[PDB]
Amino acid sequence: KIIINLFAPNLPGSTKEDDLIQKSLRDQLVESIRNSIAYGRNVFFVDGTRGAGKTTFINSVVKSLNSDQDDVKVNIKCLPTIDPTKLPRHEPILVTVTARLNKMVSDKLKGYWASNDYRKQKEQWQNHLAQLQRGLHLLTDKEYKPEYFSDALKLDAQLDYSIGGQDLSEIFEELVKRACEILDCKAILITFDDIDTQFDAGWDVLESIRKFFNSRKLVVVATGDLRLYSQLIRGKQYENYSKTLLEQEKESVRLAERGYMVEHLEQQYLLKLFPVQKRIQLKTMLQLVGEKGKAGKEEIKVKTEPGMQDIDAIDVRQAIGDAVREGLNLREGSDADMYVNELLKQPVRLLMQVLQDFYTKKYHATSLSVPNLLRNALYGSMLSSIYRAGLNYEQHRFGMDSLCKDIFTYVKQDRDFNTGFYLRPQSESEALRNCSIYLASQVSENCQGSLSKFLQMLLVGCGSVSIFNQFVTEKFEQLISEYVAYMSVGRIESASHWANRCCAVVANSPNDEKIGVFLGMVQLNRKSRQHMPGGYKKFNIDTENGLAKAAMASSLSTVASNNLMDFCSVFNLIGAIADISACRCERSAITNAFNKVIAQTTCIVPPWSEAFSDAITKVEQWLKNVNEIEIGIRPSALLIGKVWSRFYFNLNNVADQHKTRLYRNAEHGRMASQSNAAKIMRFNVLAFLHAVLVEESLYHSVSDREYIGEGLRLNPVTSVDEFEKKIKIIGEKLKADNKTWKNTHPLFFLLISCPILHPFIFPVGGINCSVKALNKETSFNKLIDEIVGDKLLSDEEWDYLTKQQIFQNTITSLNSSTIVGASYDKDTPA
Amino acid sequence: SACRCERSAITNAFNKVIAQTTCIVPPWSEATEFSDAITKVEQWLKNVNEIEIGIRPSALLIGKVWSRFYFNLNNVADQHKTRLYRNAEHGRMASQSNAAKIMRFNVLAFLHAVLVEE
Numbered sequence: 001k002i003i004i005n006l007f008a009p010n011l012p013g014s015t016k017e018d019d020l021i022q023k024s025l026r027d028q029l030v031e032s033i034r035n036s037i038a039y040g041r042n043v044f045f046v047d048g049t050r051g052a053g054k055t056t057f058i059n060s061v062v063k064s065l066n067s068d069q070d071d072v073k074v075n076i077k078c079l080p081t082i083d084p085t086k087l088p089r090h091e092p093i094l095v096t097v098t099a100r101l102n103k104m105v106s107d108k109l110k111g112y113w114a115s116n117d118y119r120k121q122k123e124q125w126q127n128h129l130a131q132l133q134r135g136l137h138l139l140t141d142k143e144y145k146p147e148y149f150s151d152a153l154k155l156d157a158q159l160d161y162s163i164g165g166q167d168l169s170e171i172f173e174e175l176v177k178r179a180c181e182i183l184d185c186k187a188i189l190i191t192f193d194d195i196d197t198q199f200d201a202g203w204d205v206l207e208s209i210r211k212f213f214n215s216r217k218l219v220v221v222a223t224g225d226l227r228l229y230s231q232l233i234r235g236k237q238y239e240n241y242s243k244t245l246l247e248q249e250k251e252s253v254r255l256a257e258r259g260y261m262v263e264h265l266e267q268q269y270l271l272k273l274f275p276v277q278k279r280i281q282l283k284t285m286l287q288l289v290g291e292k293g294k295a296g297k298e299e300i301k302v303k304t305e306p307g308m309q310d311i312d313a314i315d316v317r318q319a320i321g322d323a324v325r326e327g328l329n330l331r332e333g334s335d336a337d338m339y340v341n342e343l344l345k346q347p348v349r350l351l352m353q354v355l356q357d358f359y360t361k362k363y364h365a366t367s368l369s370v371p372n373l374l375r376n377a378l379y380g381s382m383l384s385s386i387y388r389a390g391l392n393y394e395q396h397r398f399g400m401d402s403l404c405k406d407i408f409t410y411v412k413q414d415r416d417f418n419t420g421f422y423l424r425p426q427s428e429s430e431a432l433r434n435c436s437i438y439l440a441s442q443v444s445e446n447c448q449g450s451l452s453k454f455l456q457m458l459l460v461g462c463g464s465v466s467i468f469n470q471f472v473t474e475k476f477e478q479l480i481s482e483y484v485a486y487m488s489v490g491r492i493e494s495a496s497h498w499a500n501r502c503c504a505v506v507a508n509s510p511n512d513e514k515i516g517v518f519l520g521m522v523q524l525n526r527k528s529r530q531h532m533p534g535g536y537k538k539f540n541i542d543t544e545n546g547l548a549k550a551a552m553a554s555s556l557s558t559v560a561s562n563n564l565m566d567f568c569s570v571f572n573l574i575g576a577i578a579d580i581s582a583c584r585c586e587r588s589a590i591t592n593a594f595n596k597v598i599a600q601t602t603c604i605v606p607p608w609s610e611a612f613s614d615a616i617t618k619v620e621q622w623l624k625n626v627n628e629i630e631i632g633i634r635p636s637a638l639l640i641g642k643v644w645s646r647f648y649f650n651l652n653n654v655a656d657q658h659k660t661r662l663y664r665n666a667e668h669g670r671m672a673s674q675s676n677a678a679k680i681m682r683f684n685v686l687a688f689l690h691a692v693l694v695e696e697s698l699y700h701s702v703s704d705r706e707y708i709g710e711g712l713r714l715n716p717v718t719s720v721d722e723f724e725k726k727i728k729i730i731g732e733k734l735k736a737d738n739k740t741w742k743n744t745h746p747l748f749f750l751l752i753s754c755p756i757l758h759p760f761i762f763p764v765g766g767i768n769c770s771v772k773a774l775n776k777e778t779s780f781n782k783l784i785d786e787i788v789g790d791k792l793l794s795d796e797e798w799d800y801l802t803k804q805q806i807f808q809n810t811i812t813s814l815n816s817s818t819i820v821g822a823s824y825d826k827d828t829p830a
Numbered sequence: 831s832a833c834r835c836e837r838s839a840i841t842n843a844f845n846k847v848i849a850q851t852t853c854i855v856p857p858w859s860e861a862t863e864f865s866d867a868i869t870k871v872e873q874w875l876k877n878v879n880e881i882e883i884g885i886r887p888s889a890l891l892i893g894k895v896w897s898r899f900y901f902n903l904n905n906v907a908d909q910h911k912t913r914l915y916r917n918a919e920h921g922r923m924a925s926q927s928n929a930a931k932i933m934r935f936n937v938l939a940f941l942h943a944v945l946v947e948e
């Protein structure tokens with residue numbers, strides 16, 4: 001069968017039978033050639049984009065035809081294939097054809113046995129050759145001369161030409177007729193190679209075909225791309241127009257009619273050289289192997305490691321499949337197959353080199369890092385798309401600071417700020433679709449087994465795209481230039497720095513009635529307002545005693561302006577876990593790492609504005625299990641996109657529902673219809689936990705079967721039931737195979753034991769408790785207890801929130817804190 | 831309708847549409863119970879591969895079916911808008927249009943548009 005050997009050279013001249021992919025067209029084209037002679041210009045065309053295998057295809061037809069010339073009644077002799085790009089820049093195609101035709105005639109005359117016949121045929125052959133030579137100047141002249149007139153009137157020729165004068169077509173027509181008699185063939189096959197290397201040379205081929213190869217004894221088969229031929233023919237019809245006419249008739253009404261004529265000039269020029277019934281299109285691998293199932297009459301296999309037989313080959317869809325699936329850390333489904341179908345649409349030359357590079361590097365490793373292996377192949381084939389788009393070419397600059405830069409520019413050219421961070425190859429241009437998988441390999445390799453810096457993709461790489469789309473808005477390019485520089489895109493030193501910076505960006509937005517509850521953050525008040533009712537006092541920082549003191553310390557993000565304002569956000573919590581996990585494995589280093597995130601970090605308003613010893617022992621316990629599980633994390637590129645998509649949507653749901661529940665008195669209470677400054681931030685970390693948990697069950701590589709069930713994807717807003725039920729269902733499903741939880745949700749498993757997020761999940765006044773909601777909370781705690789090994793809060797610690805010691809396992813002061821822009825006038829209803 | 835014929839891939843498209851996809855404003859502007867439910871979904875999918883195989887769809891009818899559908903909604907949104915009266919809930923009468931009377935006459939729109947130009 002058709003088996004591709006990636007260690008065979010795979011060259012047009014190195015292809016043998018059972019290696020040809022277009023075996024059907026090689027068979028089909030041959031009889032159509034013979035039938036056109038067995039029964040005027042007779043020209044066949046083989047269309048296909050560059051890299052489809054046109055040169056490999058065109059030699060096979062010549063090779064097959066020469067094999068059994070004698071057996072068939074009609075005899076066809078084939079010239080050696082002519083490559084117009086390799087010929088001299090000024091050598092006419094008529095000279096090249098005659099020189100190759102002369103060789104076959106000369107070699108056949110030396111095979112003659114009768115001296116009487118050899119002398120007669122050779123004399124007639126050189127008679128025609130001497131007349132082409134006498135007329136070759138007509139092909140190449142810068143001017144005419146009256147001395148040529150005596151040659152045109154030179155009718156004293158022994159041979160007969162029907163047309164008077166010095167006609168090059170008649171001389172070549174009789175020369176071909178003579179060559180057919182000498183070679184004893186019914187027709188001669190002139191074969192042309194691709195012009196895609198340099199399509200300016202294709203005009204000489206096209207002009208020679210119509211001017212000279214009009215004989216009934218000539219068959220012409222040409223290859224190339226009809227678009228490239230079209231771009232070449234159209235450019236010559238413009239040269240037929242008077243140059244001065246093109247500026248004096250520059251009106252759009254007349255310009256739209258010159259283009260109409262040239263389109264008609266171009267339309268029939270193609271139709272008269274290459275008849276549609278004589279055309280043959282080279283099909284791509286996606287049109288050969290098809291989708292799952294048969295989906296195609298041609299089956300193609302491939303060899304992956306040397307020492308193969310024919311039995312142990314692999315389907316090319318599978319070979320591109322496993323390479324994409326294992327390389328990009330994907331799992332079987334639409335996403336892992338959408339990429340494969342994108343590679344099957346690429347040219348075969350590009351497809352083979354991606355396949356060949358991968359499976360020769362892979363065999364080197366066995367004498368692993370499959371994402372390193374694939375990214376080597378993908379990077380090495382998409383340079384032109386990578387360069388044109390504006391990506392990074394340096395392997396030393398394979399850093400996530402630049403990876404955020406390209407993503408912002410990738411979606412800027414993609415103009416898709418909603419799904420552009422997905423990196424799916426759905427881009428309009430193939431150049432952007434080629435970069436999509438390359439960028440996908442960057443996320444699947446650089447962020448491979450790195451629980452720290454993958455959130456920087458979620459927080460800077462894909463996060464900044466969402467923030468730029470809504471709250472921000474050539475001057476637009478200059479405006480983009482201001483945002484990309486000020487926001488520190490490409491200059492990222494810490495995730496919290498971006499988190500600090502974005503709090504000053506998402507704040508600048510018009511909100512209904514001007515309530516300082518923005519997307520994912522609450523604008524805490526740095527002042528004190530009179531007549532503040534209830535047990536809700538000013539935001540006190542000293543009241544936070546213990547671990548909970550550092551929880552909001554990172555969360556607070558002061559902004560320097562004419563009126564300084566502070567924000568507590570979930571991004572700073574996301575910034576903390578990224579930077580804290582970006583440290584060593586020693587207690588001394590992690591202690592030296594906390595000061596970076598708990599210190600008073602502060603950013604500045606953008607110009608485009610008109611305005612804990614015991615904790616560290618638990619922190620290292622988290623990191624004691626991080627490295628045991630961090631090395632097993634294989635996150636797909638779209639997995640960060642899928643997780644962030646739910647995250648960005650959850651914050652809008654939370655910032656909308658909770659904003660209108662900041663009533664006057666008794667907001668903690670018992671009802672869920674009233675919220676406080678800590679209730680909003682309670683679900684923000686819960687949203688992040690939910691966003692990580694949901695899509696990771698669906699779209700992670702280390703977890704094959706989904707563990708949510710066929711339920712509904714409702715995000716927790718104002719209620720913890722949504723987050724509770726999914727974990728409850730998870731335990732039952734894992735019991736069937738006795739599966740663990742550390743490897744089922746490694747991103748979520750290690751986001752549960754994080755001591756930074758522990759205070760923010762159970763605020764004292766930010767909690768929603770009720771008699772019917774306690775049945776949800778009694779399951780909210782019965783599941784997290786088992787997965788970790790103990791309970792984050794004891795019975796007395798947990799019971800205090802539901803219904804007198806101040807403890808650091810929960811927030812203490814943010815619950816009563818006021819929010820800027822929230823006037824406490826209307827009391828809570830019931 | 832663009833799915834497999836087994837019992838597994840049906841849920842893949844089924845559960846996909848359950849989640850309300852995120853959507854942001856375009857920049858051009860100024861600013862159990864499902865185990866047997868999927869069987870009925872697969873029951874209709876057992877038909878999509880059983881009837882339309884012998885259809886002969888032209889390209890004129892697709893626009894014709896859509897054009898009838900498009901114009902029909904332009905009348906529903908013009909007449910049901912004023913019929914949001916005080917007692918429009920549970921619209922046993924005709925002029926009492928609830929959020930379902932404005933909705934029910936949008937799915938019969940698809941059924942009607944695939945019969946006039948069918």
Ligand SMILES: Nc1ncnc2c1ncn2[C@@H]1O[C@H](COP(=O)(O)OP(=O)(O)OP(=O)(O)O)[C@@H](O)[C@H]1O
Pocket residue numbers: 004010011012015019020021022049050051052053054055056057193194196197348349350352
């Ligand atoms: N039948 C085939 N079997 C195996 N590999 C093939 C086949 N056809 C094409 N290829 C692969 O695709 C590459 C491109 O093929 P080829 O050079 O013949 O086509 P082309 O790019 O259209 O031609 P040209 O070199 O004239 O521009 C080959 O080098 C080879 O790697």
